[PDB]
């Protein structure tokens, strides 16, 4: 209550010592790893840290996704020092998508939910924000919640987009309200795009040196960086756009694109393997094609092209050049198995970019509920974010008793090992049907693939009917979340066969009871069908496993698993929470299942 940080009285009691340690280690120039349980009030802690740093005179940047950005703004504006120093939102173009190209892609890939969201105006899905300029639509994060495999490289809002575009107009209207404030709030994608732009030089305007950086939900940061260095070449819309231009240079570009298509099919059939990402040296059939594809793309004149063709051809050239850089790993999707022709080029190492970020950062604090793999072991996270080992500071985690006290772990499990077989599907569906018959509220059932989900759906559909919500490629995660909330509100007890984002991001606390968490029954039964092994399909995870062995696989599996468990208790004061783990390998007496058996032992069984 004296000689304290701004807004520290609003920070919950449990996070105050962690707050003090983070403040100290950050002012000393260290990259702090502060893991705190969800529902403890991490937003107030972030607000107090940013306020203490901004009062000192530092340039403070808080990088957080837009979902939590609203509540972060609310928690920061409550601090008077923050309101005095100023708080702005650096909403650069990489935050927004192009409605035209996103709608076209959704149509070409038969993603009805994404098409409907674009047609409806791209309105915010989760979010509210009323005193920060206008309403934020066309957000990349919502689009990703509607299509996890969104080729964001080729669907982002560019400066070459027409002025009458809604996303462009929203960006310009937001940029007009941008002032030089003490605290700048950005997204993970904004921070990563800014770092990449700053490196490629040696509207995007972040401080060239971040005195104090505060990353919230830091377990997403790397993925953001990974997305910013991904390049996508979508051949069908590019070919269509070129078909809609003057014939002076149309024929050569179209013939070069068809040559590239044929060479991509050749390389695809050259070695099927298992969706393997190969360098350009392993598929030389694309080297001339790609080269030709670039030349013709620059040959046709801009005197006659609209802004749409301009941005499309520029993005295509950037992608084809990043493919021919040799520093990338390629993934081909063509006629044999993918109706939508596409060439992906990613970076299996983000070390230079993240090091450029940390070199331009005086001090930093990373906040999340899943920073450590076990205890305070942030080694996997440090490696992912490429934090210099001398600057990393693994503070103790904060996970109170209420995060597991209302939870009762059940002894029942599916005896047949998860082998993607119809027999496993039958047994696991019998188990899920039992859990659904006993369940008092909404039931979430996490799966590891679309195939397991389809089998479990074919079983549980005839049994449940009104209650079942099957996630798929067409049925996004957001539409399933909305169906879940609606069916729970109607009195039905829904059973959501979820995957993907259902493991990592969704907030299943009933917002109809913000002051009475004792009556929260929105998610009463969490069910884990499989240990999430092999769910990370990033190039950096491929390199990390190739270097460190099966320990990286096991640590990523435990990280994903603890995230999935973190969907059940989202706040204190809840009750009647049930946890189910059906993977027979847990109770199999193996060696690699020892980490998981730790967390599950931490609960109380019944």
């Amino acid at each position: 209550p004296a000689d304290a940080l701004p807004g520290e009285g609003a920070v919950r009691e449990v996070l105050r010592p962690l707050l003090k340690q983070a403040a100290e280690k950050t002012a000393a120039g260290k990259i702090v790893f502060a893991e705190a349980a969800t529902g403890t009030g991490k937003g107030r802690m972030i607000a107090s840290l940013a306020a203490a740093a901004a009062i000192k005179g530092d340039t403070v940047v808080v990088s957080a996704p837009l979902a939590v950005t609203w509540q972060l703004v609310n928690d920061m504006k409550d601090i008077p020092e923050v309101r005095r120093v100023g708080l702005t939102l650096s909403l650069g173009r990489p935050n927004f998508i192009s409605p035209q190209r996103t709608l076209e892609w959704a149509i070409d890939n038969e993603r009805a939910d994404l098409a409907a969201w674009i047609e409806g105006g791209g309105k915010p899905l989760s979010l509210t924000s009323k005193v920060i300029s206008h309403e934020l639509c066309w957000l990349l994060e919502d689009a990703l919640l509607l299509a996890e495999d969104l080729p964001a490289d080729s669907l982002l809002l560019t400066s070459e987009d027409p002025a009458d575009c809604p996303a462009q107009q929203l960006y310009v209207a937001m940029r007009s309200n941008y002032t030089e404030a003490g605290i700048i709030l950005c997204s993970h994608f904004m921070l990563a795009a800014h770092t990449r732009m700053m490196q490629m030089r040696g509207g995007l305007s972040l401080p060239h040196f971040i005195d104090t950086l505060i990353v919230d939900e830091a377990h997403l940061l790397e993925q953001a960086f990974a997305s910013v260095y991904t390049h996508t070449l979508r051949l069908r819309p590019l070919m269509r756009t070129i078909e809609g231009l003057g014939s002076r240079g149309r024929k050569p570009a179209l013939d070069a694109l068809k040559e590239l298509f044929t060479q991509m099919q050749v390389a695809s059939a050259r070695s099927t393997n298992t969706s393997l990402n190969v360098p350009l040296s392993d598929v030389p059939e694309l080297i001339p094609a790609l080269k030709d594809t670039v030349k013709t793309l620059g040959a046709l004149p801009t005197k006659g092209m609209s802004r749409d063709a301009r941005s499309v051809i520029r993005i295509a050239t950037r992608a084809a050049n990043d493919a021919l850089s040799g520093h990338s790993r390629l993934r081909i999707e063509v006629t044999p198995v993918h109706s939508y022709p596409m060439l992906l080029s990613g970076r299996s190492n983000l070390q230079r970019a993240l090091l450029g970020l940390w070199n331009a950062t005086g001090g930093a604090t990373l906040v999340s509920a899943t920073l450590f793999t076990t205890g305070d072991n942030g080694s996997l996270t440090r490696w992912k974010l490429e934090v210099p080992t001398e600057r990393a500071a693994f503070l103790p985690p904060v996970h109170p008793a209420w995060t597991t006290a209302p939870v009762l772990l059940h002894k029942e499990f599916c005896a047949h090992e998860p082998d993607d077989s119809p027999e496993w599907a039958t047994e696991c569906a019998q188990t899920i049907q039992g859990v659904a018959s006993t369940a008092q509220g909404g039931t979430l059932v996490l799966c590891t693939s679309y195939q397991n989900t389809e089998l479990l759906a074919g079983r549980l559909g005839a049994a449940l009917g009104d209650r079942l919500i099957v996630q798929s490629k067409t049925s996004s995660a957001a539409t399933c979340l909305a169906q879940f909330k609606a069916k729970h509100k109607a009195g039905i007890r829904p059973v959501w066969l979820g995957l993907g984002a259902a493991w990592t991001g969704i907030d299943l606390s009933d917002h109809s009871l913000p002051d009475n968490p004792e009556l929260d029954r929105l998610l009463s039964d969490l069910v884990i069908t499989r240990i999430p092994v092999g769910q990370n399909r990033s190039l950096t995870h491929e390199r990390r496993t190739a270097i460190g062995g099966f320990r990286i696989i096991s640590q990523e599996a435990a990280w994903h698993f603890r995230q999935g468990l973190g969907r059940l208790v989202r706040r204190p004061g809840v009750t009647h929470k049930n946890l189910w783990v059906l993977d027979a390998r847990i109770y199999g007496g193996a060696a690699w299942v020892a980490p998981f058996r730790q967390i599950l032992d931490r609960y109380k069984k019944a």
Side-chain angles (χ1 to χ4, degrees), residues 1-2 4-19 21-129 131-147 149-247 249-271 275-302 304-410 412-606:
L5 304 181
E8 185 173 348
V11 176
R12 206 73 60 87
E13 182 71 15
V14 188
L15 296 189
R16 291 180 180 177
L18 174 67
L19 168 74
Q21 286 178 288
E24 296 185 46
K25 304 284 180 183
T26 312
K30 295 245 172 295
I31 316 297
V32 176
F33 292 69
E35 167 174 294
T38 181
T40 58
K42 298 193 292 290
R44 299 257 184 243
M45 177 183 64
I46 292 175
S48 293
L49 281 180
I55 283 291
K56 283 155 51 189
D58 294 359
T59 53
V60 183
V61 168
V62 178
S63 184
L66 299 164
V68 301
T69 284
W70 167 81
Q71 189 183 14
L72 279 184
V73 173
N74 268 17
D75 291 329
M76 282 190 291
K77 293 183 72 64
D78 288 355
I79 322 297
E81 295 78 10
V82 170
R83 269 178 293 165
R84 166 206 157 81
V85 301
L87 171 63
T88 49
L89 280 72
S90 189
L91 287 163
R93 284 186 181 88
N95 285 287
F96 306 99
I97 60 168
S98 169
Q100 175 176 1
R101 306 186 236 105
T102 305
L103 182 57
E104 183 196 30
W105 179 89
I107 293 169
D108 290 353
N109 292 100
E110 292 165 346
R111 315 299 192 81
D113 303 330
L114 179 61
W117 173 75
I118 284 296
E119 290 177 348
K123 320 298 287 181
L125 296 176
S126 57
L127 309 181
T128 44
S129 56
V131 299
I132 299 284
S133 308
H134 326 261
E135 187 187 31
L136 291 184
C137 304
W138 319 106
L139 294 180
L140 166 63
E141 300 184 12
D142 291 335
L144 289 171
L145 192 51
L146 256 57
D149 57 336
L150 190 77
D153 170 72
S154 309
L155 305 180
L156 279 191
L157 178 70
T158 72
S159 59
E160 297 295 331
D161 278 316
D164 60 357
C165 176
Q168 196 70 267
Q169 293 174 346
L170 180 55
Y171 165 79
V172 177
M174 293 297 312
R175 189 180 176 271
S176 71
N177 308 135
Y178 188 84
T179 57
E180 296 302 323
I183 304 178
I184 298 178
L185 198 159
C186 65
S187 56
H188 293 345
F189 296 90
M190 180 77 267
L191 176 58
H194 182 261
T195 303
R196 182 175 185 263
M197 187 62 62
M198 291 279 93
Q199 283 206 359
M200 285 198 302
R201 81 161 56 189
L204 285 72
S205 190
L206 279 182
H208 295 174
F209 184 87
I210 314 298
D211 276 312
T212 297
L213 176 64
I214 303 180
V215 177
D216 190 13
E217 306 292 71
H219 58 297
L220 275 70
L221 185 57
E222 184 197 12
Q223 184 44 51
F225 269 88
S227 176
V228 168
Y229 281 93
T230 306
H231 287 267
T232 307
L233 185 54
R234 306 173 299 120
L235 268 81
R236 188 143 66 190
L238 176 64
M239 196 171 302
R240 174 156 48 241
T241 295
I242 298 182
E243 287 175 358
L245 293 181
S247 64
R250 182 212 305 157
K251 183 69 178 300
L254 292 180
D255 296 0
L257 272 179
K258 191 53 171 55
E259 177 78 8
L260 175 62
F261 194 22
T262 53
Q263 300 310 319
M264 284 191 307
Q265 302 178 52
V266 166
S268 173
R270 186 176 178 269
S271 183
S275 296
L276 192 58
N277 285 255
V278 299
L280 191 55
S281 60
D282 296 5
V283 282
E285 304 87 3
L286 304 180
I287 298 184
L290 287 168
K291 280 177 178 177
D292 211 13
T293 304
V294 182
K295 175 164 58 183
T296 53
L297 272 180
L300 54 90
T302 56
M305 294 166 47
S306 59
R307 313 301 302 274
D308 318 332
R310 209 75 53 83
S311 67
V312 168
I313 295 182
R314 265 142 186 79
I315 290 298
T317 48
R318 287 190 177 268
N321 286 328
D322 188 72
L324 288 175
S325 66
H327 297 165
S328 61
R329 303 187 62 81
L330 308 182
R331 183 176 180 172
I332 303 183
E333 296 182 0
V334 285
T335 301
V337 72
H338 294 115
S339 60
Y340 197 104
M342 197 173 69
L343 182 57
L344 296 171
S345 85
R347 298 308 182 92
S348 60
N349 172 281
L350 308 168
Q351 183 179 358
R352 183 169 291 106
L354 291 164
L355 255 56
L357 167 63
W358 300 128
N359 284 327
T361 300
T365 300
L366 314 180
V367 182
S368 162
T370 48
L371 289 182
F372 309 134
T373 43
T374 288
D376 52 334
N377 186 87
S379 293
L380 185 51
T381 285
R382 177 184 67 196
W383 194 2
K384 286 199 279 194
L385 294 182
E386 298 284 350
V387 174
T389 318
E390 58 276 15
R391 305 186 66 196
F394 300 159
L395 294 194
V398 167
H399 305 279
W402 54 258
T403 65
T404 65
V407 179
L408 270 66
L409 180 54
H410 293 259
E412 291 80 7
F413 67 97
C414 182
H416 186 189
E417 283 205 2
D419 58 335
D420 315 324
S421 73
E423 298 74 5
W424 165 85
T426 302
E427 280 201 21
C428 192
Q430 292 173 1
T431 308
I432 296 168
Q433 185 173 335
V435 180
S437 298
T438 316
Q440 281 183 340
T443 295
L444 177 63
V445 176
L446 301 173
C447 309
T448 64
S449 74
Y450 287 116
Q451 188 261 359
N452 296 153
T453 302
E454 293 159 12
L455 292 178
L456 291 176
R459 309 299 183 281
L460 298 160
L464 278 299
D466 195 358
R467 309 165 57 179
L468 193 62
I469 300 172
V470 181
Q471 189 170 345
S472 57
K473 186 178 174 179
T474 64
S475 303
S476 61
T479 37
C480 287
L481 176 68
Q483 293 182 52
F484 196 85
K485 297 183 183 179
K487 291 181 184 290
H488 177 63
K489 194 181 69 176
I492 310 179
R493 311 191 310 276
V495 183
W496 174 6
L497 301 178
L499 61 94
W503 281 84
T504 55
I506 59 182
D507 183 60
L508 282 192
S509 47
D510 198 341
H511 296 325
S512 308
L513 298 153
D515 305 336
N516 293 272
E518 57 272 16
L519 264 65
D520 190 354
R521 304 293 187 273
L522 173 58
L523 176 59
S524 66
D525 292 76
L526 177 58
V527 178
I528 289 91
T529 54
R530 305 185 49 176
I531 301 178
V533 178
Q535 296 306 116
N536 188 325
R537 310 174 194 94
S538 56
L539 304 186
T540 61
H541 176 80
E542 197 181 24
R543 178 178 180 261
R544 275 188 299 270
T545 54
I547 294 176
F550 181 74
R551 190 188 69 258
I552 306 304
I553 297 177
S554 173
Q555 284 188 304
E556 262 283 319
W559 180 76
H560 199 111
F561 179 67
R562 205 220 289 175
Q563 291 186 94
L565 294 182
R567 311 271 72 84
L568 184 60
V569 170
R570 302 286 291 172
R571 55 170 163 178
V574 299
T575 181
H576 297 156
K577 296 296 183 65
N578 295 344
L579 176 59
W580 309 74
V581 186
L582 310 188
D583 200 324
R585 299 177 295 184
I586 287 288
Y587 316 89
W592 63 281
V593 304
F596 317 99
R597 285 181 61 86
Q598 277 169 232
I599 301 103
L600 301 180
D601 279 352
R602 186 167 288 106
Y603 294 98
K604 180 58 178 178
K605 301 180 71 65

